[PDB]
Structures are given as C-alpha cells and as structure tokens.
Amino acid sequence: VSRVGSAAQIKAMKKVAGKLKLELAQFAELEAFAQFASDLDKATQNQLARGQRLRELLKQPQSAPLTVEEQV
Amino acid sequence: PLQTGLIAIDAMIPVGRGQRELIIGDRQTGKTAVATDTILNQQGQNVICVYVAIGQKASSVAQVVTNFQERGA
Amino acid sequence: VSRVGSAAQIKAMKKVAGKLKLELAQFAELEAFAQFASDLDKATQNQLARGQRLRELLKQPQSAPLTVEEQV
Amino acid sequence: PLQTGLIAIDAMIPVGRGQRELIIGDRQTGKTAVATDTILNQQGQNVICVYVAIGQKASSVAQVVTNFQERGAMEYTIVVAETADSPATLQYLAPYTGAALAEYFMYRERHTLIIYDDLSKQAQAYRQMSLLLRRPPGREAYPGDVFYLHSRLLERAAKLSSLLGEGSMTALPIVETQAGDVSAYIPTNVISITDGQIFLSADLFNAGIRPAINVGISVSRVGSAAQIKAMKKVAGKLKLELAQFAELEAFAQFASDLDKATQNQLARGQRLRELLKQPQSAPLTVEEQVMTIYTGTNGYLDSLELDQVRKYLVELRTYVKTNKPEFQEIISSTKTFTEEAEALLKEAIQEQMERFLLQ
Amino acid sequence: MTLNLCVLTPNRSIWNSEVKEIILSTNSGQIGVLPNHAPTATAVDIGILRIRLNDQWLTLALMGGFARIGNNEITILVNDAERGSDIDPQEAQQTLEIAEANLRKAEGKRQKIEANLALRRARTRVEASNT
Amino acid sequence: ANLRELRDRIGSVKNTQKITEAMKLVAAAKVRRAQEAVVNGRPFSETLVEVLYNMNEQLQTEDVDVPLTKIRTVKKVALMVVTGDRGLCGGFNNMLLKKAESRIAELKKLGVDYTIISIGKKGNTYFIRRPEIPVDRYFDGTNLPTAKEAQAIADDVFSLFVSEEVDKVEMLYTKFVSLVKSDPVIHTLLPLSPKGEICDINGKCVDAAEDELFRLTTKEGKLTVERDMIKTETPAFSPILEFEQDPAQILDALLPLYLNSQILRALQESL
Amino acid sequence: LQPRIVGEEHYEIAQRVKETLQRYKELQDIIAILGLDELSEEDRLTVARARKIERFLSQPFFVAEVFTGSPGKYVGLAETIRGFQLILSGELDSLPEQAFYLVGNIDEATAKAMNLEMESKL
Amino acid sequence: GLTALTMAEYFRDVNEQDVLLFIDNIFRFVQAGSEVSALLGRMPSAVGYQPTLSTEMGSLQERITSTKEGSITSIQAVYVPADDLTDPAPATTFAHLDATTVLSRGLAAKGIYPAVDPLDSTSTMLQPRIVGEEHYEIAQRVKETLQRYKELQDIIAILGLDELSEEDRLTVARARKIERFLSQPFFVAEVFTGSPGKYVGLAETIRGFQLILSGELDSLPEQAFYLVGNIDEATAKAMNLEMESKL
Amino acid sequence: LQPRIVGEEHYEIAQRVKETLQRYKELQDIIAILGLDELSEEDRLTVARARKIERFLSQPFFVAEVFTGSPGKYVGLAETIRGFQLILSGELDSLPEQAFYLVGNIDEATAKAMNLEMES
C-alpha cells in the first residue's frame, strides 16, 4: 500500500505502470485455480506467458539498482 | 519521488519524499536488501541518507558498511 | 436450561409440552447428521419434516405476545 | 537391562539399570498400572524396589500395598508414602527420603529401583511452600526452582563405576498431564531432565490397547544397551514392521482394494498390535517376551485370527514352558538367540499350532 | 495340425489354448469342426458347446456368438461364455422353472423379446448344467 | 477449554488431510486398474471391428437389412446418461447432468418426444425424483460391470430397439481425454452403420479423433493422461470365406456382439 | 470395573461398549466430511450400533419427571447387561434408533419400537 | 556457556586457530537465564522468559565472530518448545544463527549416514555471488532432483510404475545415485561400524555431484556411490564390484 | 433496523440479505476444504446469490478514486433496495459475479455485464 504513491510517481511511470498493475493483479487472480476451469483458453495461455514473464521482469539482483530510465 | 531502484516498489507502490513506507516482512526475507538498494540508488540525488541499525549482529552491519564504502555510497 | 421445568406451567401446557424440548433436541441432532447422508428412510424423513414444522411454529415476532390459550 | 515384564517396554523403548524414564500421560491411563507391573516383575531378579507414593488418596496406597503383599513382591519393596492430607513440607520431602534409601542400597554394591508417584504433587507442594514464603512466582505460579528441585533428585540415580561396585538406581518417575499437555512447565522440566519418556495416551486406553503405550512419541535414548542379544534382533524386526504398520494406518478399510503386499502388511501389523495387548499385573519374563515377539513378527500368526491370537499365544507360551524347558536353559544361560534355539522355538510353534487347529 | 481355440468374451478371454475337435450350434443349424478346416464363417447362436481334445466332452455354455474361422484357429466371439459345471444345476432348474413361468407374463413386442430370450437362456443354462 | 478445542480442531484437519491422501491413492490405483481393463477388452473389439469391416466388402453389394441397423421413422431419441454410482468425484456427475439437461432441452423444440435410460445410482436417483422425464428403466451398480452390467444395459436397449418400440437409443458418456477436463460426448449407439464405425447423433462418424488406449504417465511430479495415439493394427480380409448361415443372419449375429462391446467400453471409460 | 471385582461378563461387555464408542468417536471427524455412503459394512454397522447404544444409556429419572414427561424408571444391573449383550451381539439392528431413547429395559425398547413402527404404518 | 566461550576466544585471540565451539544446547541456557531472572524477582517477558532475553542472547552470541587474528565458529543445538518457532527462544536464537542442519530420522531409518535432510537444511551462504555460480547451480539442481524424487516416492515407488518417463526415470536413477552419494565413511565411525574414514574437500564434492548429475555416471550400479568418499573412489568401487560381478 | 422506522419492505429485504449472507458464511468451511460440487442445487443457489451480494456490497468512493482509479459513485437507499431486490429475485443471477464488483446503481452492474461481453 502507498497512501501518497500516485502523487509522487512521475507522469512517465504513471502512464507506463497503470497497465502493469492491471495485468499483474489479474495474473495473481488467474494463477489461483488455474488448472481446472481456464486451462486451454487463448486469454489464459497468453496471460500465463504475460504473468509469469511479468514476474520474471520484476525480479532483480541485490545491490544492482535501476534508475528511472531503465525502469520505464 | 524517492525512487528505491526496485521495479515493483517504484512501479506500483511508490514512495514519496516525505512518506513513511514500512518494510514489514519475516526474518531473512530481504528487507535489508531493499533498504540498501534504496540507499545505493541515491548516488546522484541530494538525499542525505542515514541508516540506523538497532540491535543487529555486528557481522551484518560490518558487511553493509563494506558495501556502502565499496559502492561509492 | 430450565431448572424448574414443567412445574412452572399450567396443566394444559404441561400435557401438550411434555417431552417437547427433548424431542426437539433429538430432531436438531439428527438433522445435523442427516446432512451427512444421501438416502434415508421415509419414516425418519417425515420425522425431519415434523421437526421442521415444530421449529417453524416457534418464531415469534417482536412486540407480538402470544397468550397461553394461543400457545397451547 | 532392567526387565520390565511388558512387551512394549522391554522390546521397543528399553529401560536399563540406571536410566531415568518417566511415564507421561493423562489421568487414569495406566501409570500406576505399569509402575506396579515393573515392581511385581522384579521378583525373578534380586533388586530392591522403592515406591514413593506422594499426595495420594491414602486408600489407593493401602490397596497397592495389599497388592504388593498378596503378590509376594513386598519381600523386598520399601514403599515410602506421604499422602495429600500431609503438609506441603512432607510431600516435598518424601522423594528425597526414597532417594536416600535407594542411594544407600545402591552404595552397598546392590542394584536398586525407585518409583516416584507423582512429581506433579511434589512440585505443587514445593510451589505452595514457596508462595507462602513470598518467594517470587514464575511461570504458572511455579517458582524458579522446580527445575533445580527435580534435577537435583533425578541426578542421583546412577550406574556407578566398577570400582564403587556398579550399583544402580533406576529412577522411573511419573508426571501426569492435563488435557494431553507435555509442554507445560513441570512436564517440560521433567521430560528434559529424564533420559527417555513413555507416553501413555488414554485414547489407546479406550481403544483396547492396554497398556496404552504410544510408541510414536515414547522413546528411550539408551538403545540396544538395555536389550539382551536375544532381544535386540526381534526388536529391530518388530520396529521395522510396526513403523510399516503405522505408516499404513490410514488405508484401513481399503485393504481388499490394496496391494496384496500391503494387505499382508496391514494384517500382520494388526496381529502384532493384538499381541501387544496384555492384562494388568501379568509379568512376562525374557523367555516369554522373546517367544511372544518371535512368534508374532515372523508371520506365524498370519494364518490365525485377530481374536484368537491372545488365547492362542498364551496357550503356546504354556506349551513351550511345559513341554520344551530347554529354551529357558538356552536363553538364561547363553543370553543369545542361536540357531538351535530358534529352530527349537519354531518346532514348538509348529506342534502347538497343529494341536490347536484341531482343538 | 491341432487348431487353436480362443473362447473370447468382451471382458476376458476364457480358453486360449489349443483344441483338436469342437462341436458347436449355429443360428440355423449345427456345425462340426475337424482339424484343418476351410476358412468358414460361423454364426453361432445361444447354446452349449461340445469340445473334444484328448479328454471327455465338456459343455461350454455360450449365449450368442460368431466364429470367423480361417486357418488353424477359431475365434469364437461370444458376449457370454461359461463352463457347464460352474453353473449350479439346481440353480439351472430354478432358472428353468422361473423362465417357463415368466414367459407367459409377456404380451407384447417389448415383452416377448424378453420372453423367448429368458426361456432359451434358462434352457441353454440347463443344457450345460446337466452335462 | 479453548486450547483443547483448538488442538482437537487441529487434529480433525489433520485426519481429514491424511484420509484425503488415502482416497487419492486408492483412486489412482483403481484408475490404473481401469486402464488395464480397457486392454482386457481391447483385442476382442479390435478383431471384432476388423471382422465387421473385412467381411462387409463382398456384402457391400447385397442388402442385408439388419433390424439393429434399420432406419425406423425418426421420431424419438432415447438417452442413456452414464453417471457413476458415486459422489464427491467432482464435476463428473454435474457436467453429465448439464449435457443431459441440455440434450433433453435441445430435443424438445424439434418435436422429438425423447426418453431416458439411467445407469448410475447418483443419476438414477435424480431421475427417480424428477417425474417429468419419461424413464423406462433404472440401473444401479450391483451387477458386475465386466460382464453383467454391460449385458443388462445391452439387452435392455436391445429390447427397446429390436422390437422397435422407441425410435432411437443414444448414449451420453464421457472419456479419458484429460484429468483437468472431462467432456461428456453424445454418441448415438443403436442406429449404427454396418462398417464398425460409430455415427454421431447426426451421423457425423466422429471416430476420426479415435486416439484410443489412454495410459497414465508423468512428464513431471504430476501425472497427465498422455492419450498416446493408436499403436497396432492387424487386419487383412477373408479371400473366399464360402460361409454358411445366411449372411443376413450372420450380420444380425455380429451386430449385438459389437453392441455389447461398445457398451462395455463405455462403462469402463465412464468409471 | 475389574475381572476379579465385578465379574467376567460385566467387565467384557463394559470394555466392549467403551471400545465401540471410542471407535465411533474416532470415526466421527472422518464421516463428517467424507459422507455416509463411503464406509464399509463393518464400519457402518459400528456407526449404527453405537448410535443405538448412546441413546440406550439414557433413562428417565425419578426426580426428572418434571423435565422429561415420563414416569420414573429403575433399571437393574442384570437388565442392563442383558440389554448390551442383545444390542451388541446383533439381534436388534432392525429396531429404530429412537426406540432406545428413554427406555428402562430392553423389553421396553422393543415395545417402544413396536409403538413407533405401528404409529408410522398407521 | 560463557566459560566455554572465553576458553575458545583465548584460542582465537592468541594462537590464531580456527576454533570450533559447541553449545549443546542454547535452550538450556535461555531457560536457566529465565530461572535466574525469575528468582531475582524480575518482571518476566511475554511467554515467561527473562525480561532480558535478547541482550542475554546477544552478549553470548556476538562474542563468536571472525577477527583479523582468527575465527571462532560455533555449532549450537536448539530445542524448540513443541516445534513452535513463534516462541521467543527459537525466534531469538535464529536472529543470530546463519544456517541450520536438520538431521532426519528418515535418513537414519533408510540407513545412510550422516542423517541430515537436504531439503530441510538452509544456509545464507548458499548464494551464487558468495560461493560461486558453479556451486550454486550444482546445489540448485541437486535440490530439484531430490524434490522430484520426494514427490515421486508416492507416485512410482508405491503405485504407478507405468514406465514413468525416460526424462523421469533419469531423475529417479540419479536421485538414487545422489541419496547414496550423500553418505560418507567417517573417521570415527571406523571402530564403531566398520567404515574407514575419508576427507572430501569442497571442490571434490562439487565435481563429484557435477558428474553424477551431468550424465556421465548413470551406468554404474547405484551402490557404487554408497558409503564412498570422492568420485574417483566411486568409479573404482564400481570397477571392483564389477569384478565381483564377473566372479 | 426496525420495521417501524424503515418500513416493511426495506427491513424485509435487509433481513433476507443477512439471511443469505449467513448461509454462505456457514457453508464457507465446507467450501474452503472441498469446494462447491458436493452441494445441493438449492444450496448453490444461496451460495451464488451471496457470492453476488458480497461483491455488490462494494462501492467505489469519491475519496478512494485516487487509489483504485474507479471514480466515486453516490447511490441512494431507494435504489440500493431495488438493486438488492433484483439480485434476490433472480432476474440478474445469470450474468457473472465479477460484473457486480465496484459499481454504483444496478444499471451500472447490468451495463458492466453487457460491456464485458463486447471486448472479446
């Protein structure tokens, strides 16, 4: 949670990170009960390749920060 | 903004300049790593960091002091 | 619990409410178990129905008093 | 080995001369039962047994004294006793008097035993004596000394050196539990001081298994040193088969649906467990114990039934005690389970089952 | 020389070893099989079977099949095959009486097709269980 | 009493956990048995349909007019909903009843006036308590599915169809195409082609995706069904079979065999 | 309750009753979530017999006639051991599981069973 | 504990040895601290431990370090009250611990010593940029192989056996090889059980498990790696058992 | 919440809403351990109705729009009652459960269901 998060988050990060938040939230929801109901859908296969890979691009090495340009 | 250098933090849970952000988490879950990443990201910005370490092992704070000196921080 | 029991009722309600609370405890305890079942007997299912009717007749609305004649 | 007279104790969780081993478990579960079974079994040996009846009813004490007397085992047993109506002072004292008597008899080059019953009443007496003296209370009102109080009296039961006459006091105390809690202060203290523990779960006591010893928690740390050579082999076979029985306990009514191997596994484990049951105050000597465990764990009851096997095994024990007295010769003179002893036992088994299948 | 036998049912395969001589009914008549017969299809009906291979004759209670004989092997595909001894002859006579009774309670096409069926069923159980 | 009741609730959620593992393992054991029981009926139906094809070639010219494969005036469609006699399985029963209610809703607007057959206790009890559907016969799981249950349903649909009482008899049963999705396919049974290839309810001849002989395997720590398409095939033909017994009667002898084998494989695949 | 203090048949029947009840209370947290059609015949027989036994151990007291609505009862030891031999050994598994509710003797359980079934058949 | 600590830190301070300290165990120290403080009339902390729990732990633990003179390393057993890591004594012991070595009754019952549990042993040292990327990936792949086999114990070793998969048979075989290879004939198990001792250096462990994994030692018997030291000793044991196979 | 203050209809609808919510709350343990297929149809009717209610009990805020992004909606009482009556009647149970999530009036939920079947 961040109370004043979207205020201090810059315009560039705002415009690029809205859709990231939407897709990561839906991936955290679609991973739950992923097997029985939504196994071979187009949307769920695409969202698995975009919700495992989103998490792949979140991970990071310790003591190797990314300035805002590389972030966006 | 005060960017911590992490994609997730600085992406979807941003931190202002003037905002408390509690790094709550279990033992050995990476909170010290988050704090050191934040401090090392301030290599240019006029953010005079201070890192106070209550009741920690001396080898941990010595290794962090070594990191802070070697990373030009 | 009622520690005085049917010596605190008139003979009418003492007659008709003789073994009422105990048979209602029995009906509640066997309705709790008849949900752990699939097929039953018609005799016990009619017993469950009559216990449900005894259960439904005791809902009394607020500010709606019943007299002893109505009750019996 | 300090031979107990129970198959579970001497077979699985072995108690030796010197090792401390308490009986934890809920109220009215078999602690006094196995505590008297042990003492009544010691008649074949020569040891000096001590019972410390603390805080009891003064009528159970007279009852168990009458038991020890009408069974003959009072010929050596001293029973110190200080019931509940006594002050807290004498309840606190009495285990130390029992320990001093056992210490003296142990220092006369003579093996001994001592039973504490219970350390909970002793700890309650000491806690009351402390709280009356305005000593600062601690966890659940027990003062900060009940650990030192219990460790002080439990470190006195030793197997002394061979220059001091190898005397041995085997402290076998008892600490009851409330609602199945061994993580309270007094139970944790005593299970940390003592060497091994023996968990008597009252569920098994209501499940026909008497003595209600729970093998999944009960464990001793002496190991094979408290089992004779003829014992440790079949004890290993029995622990193997009983672990393979308990790990297959969930597959209860699916035994026909099971594999044939696991079906034999479940049925043989059930025969082993029904063998494990034995009545109160019925001692078994080391010949009888090795005969029972052998005929059980080697599939010589798998033709039999779960009901008959108790009558069947007592009749086999009578048959091999009366007809084949040489097994007792071999076991008590050689202390090993040799090839000729095993074959003698199998031929006794075979003729007894042939006579009994006709009955 | 010795032809092969496969008394094959839907669920299991009962007899799979060899045989030198079998005698079996058909939907119209009967047939006898000598060693080394021509490839000859066979519509075997509900009925018992006579088998002979260095032993006495035995009844195999079959209940409707088909045998596409070729060379050296007869594939007797029956939906219901069983031996005449295992079916109890008192059970066969009880089935016989039950079927003879319950033939007459059928008075329709839906009913008669379960009347002569049950009658020949008990009859061809009996014609095995006696033998 | 709070800590004791909390410990006892802990113990209850432990006992249920371990017995659920137990039911998992005995269910996987019976699955592994059932896929072997498929192979126990595999060679029969294999050579059977091979006969039904190879003997049909010289009888492609003449017309046999078998009553099992006749065309009655297409008015009614009977329905055997093949539910297991069990509960707690999951969507199996409920997806069967979904396709079942969909079929008996889909057949009401065409003007069909369908009927139903029930061969699962958890299904035939539902058809007991619902009088709107015309039920001809209830089947339970008491007789053996190896021969006896198969034969009971076989001769029952045979009695409904060979005296030509109901018009059609079709089958509603699922397969082993996966673990995470069972699909109740609707295949017709009693109007059949004399070749040995089943037709759809509309006659599509849907056996192009046959893919038979499911056998369980593991690509990783979990097990997938790995449907593992067709392995072996051994027909040739009969050169001159010079056969007796009235080829019309021969095909009317060969049809009920293949029908019973179809019903047996259906019950095994449902189970 | 001992073999040498309270007789052999009493002790065997008492430990056997406690046995089958412990079996039922162990079975309970399984048959809760599993269901009743997924036990074996020995297990369902145990469940039904324990469910008879538990009701049969309820007697309308003399002082509780105000609380029950039934004349007071006094059961002998002979009658009780007879009732538990009869319930356990199998010859009463056709009686209703409310027939053993608040009855003195096993004879009264049988007469109440006849009463229940007759009323239900009318 | 402080007695043993100062006796060890003398050896650190003046002889520059690599001192090895053993406090078996730390729970008795924490309990005795609580009992001293409870007799002193101090108001106790949350669960009942002494009010000074963390500082008493620290003033014993943070004297056990590595200086420029030498380095004292301590291996101290822990008892956890009813396996409750939420209790203050374990949760404060782990605030100074680095690794854990949870010995198994399962690998004792199977009969391969040392009886540790590899899936339950944690270390802060097992990171790539601490002990190498090679050692890191070797440990990670070994963990994944054993984690395959532990779930596959129920799958194939009980029921399935349906020619599991060659990509899964390759894991089951080498998981057998690795469970055998984890053991080692100790120096002081010689007079105990008959096993002559061997030292296996770290690089030799990494190379041995590397070649057990990499598809070079799948053909030898699974017992050619059981109770053996290095990997060359394992291949030599394979040749000697094969000489007994041709016998 | 008494029928003399809020009238009969409002208190009636509120009472039945609380009834169905508690029915789902009682079934929640059996649902969490095993699931939903084991239930009767009359039980899954209440589970489905309460799963729709538990989402329609959300309402986006005029303040918390700066957090979620969904702008604030003010909804009346006289229309909250009609929305919950349309839910409990069963004229809306066909459309999915995430349709009711984070809306205002009932037509926002129905237009949400109509809208999320356009973006295929």
Ligand SMILES: Nc1ncnc2c1ncn2[C@@H]1O[C@H](COP(=O)(O)OP(=O)(O)OP(=O)(O)O)[C@@H](O)[C@H]1O
């Ligand atoms: N993002 C990361 N990438 C690589 N390693 C990491 C990362 N985050 C944490 N670690 C490693 O995890 C270990 C524990 O992390 P960290 O020390 O930050 O947690 P902690 O709560 O401070 O632990 P403790 O409080 O016990 O010191 C450290 O060795 C650190 O190197």
Ligand SMILES: Nc1ncnc2c1ncn2[C@@H]1O[C@H](COP(=O)(O)OP(=O)(O)OP(=O)(O)O)[C@@H](O)[C@H]1O
């Ligand atoms: N092996 C056994 N077989 C049959 N009955 C037994 C057995 N062991 C104990 N009992 C019975 O259990 C009852 C209680 O036994 P015991 O007194 O040993 O329990 P306890 O825990 O010592 O009781 P308390 O907690 O009151 O001291 C006795 O009536 C005894 O007859």
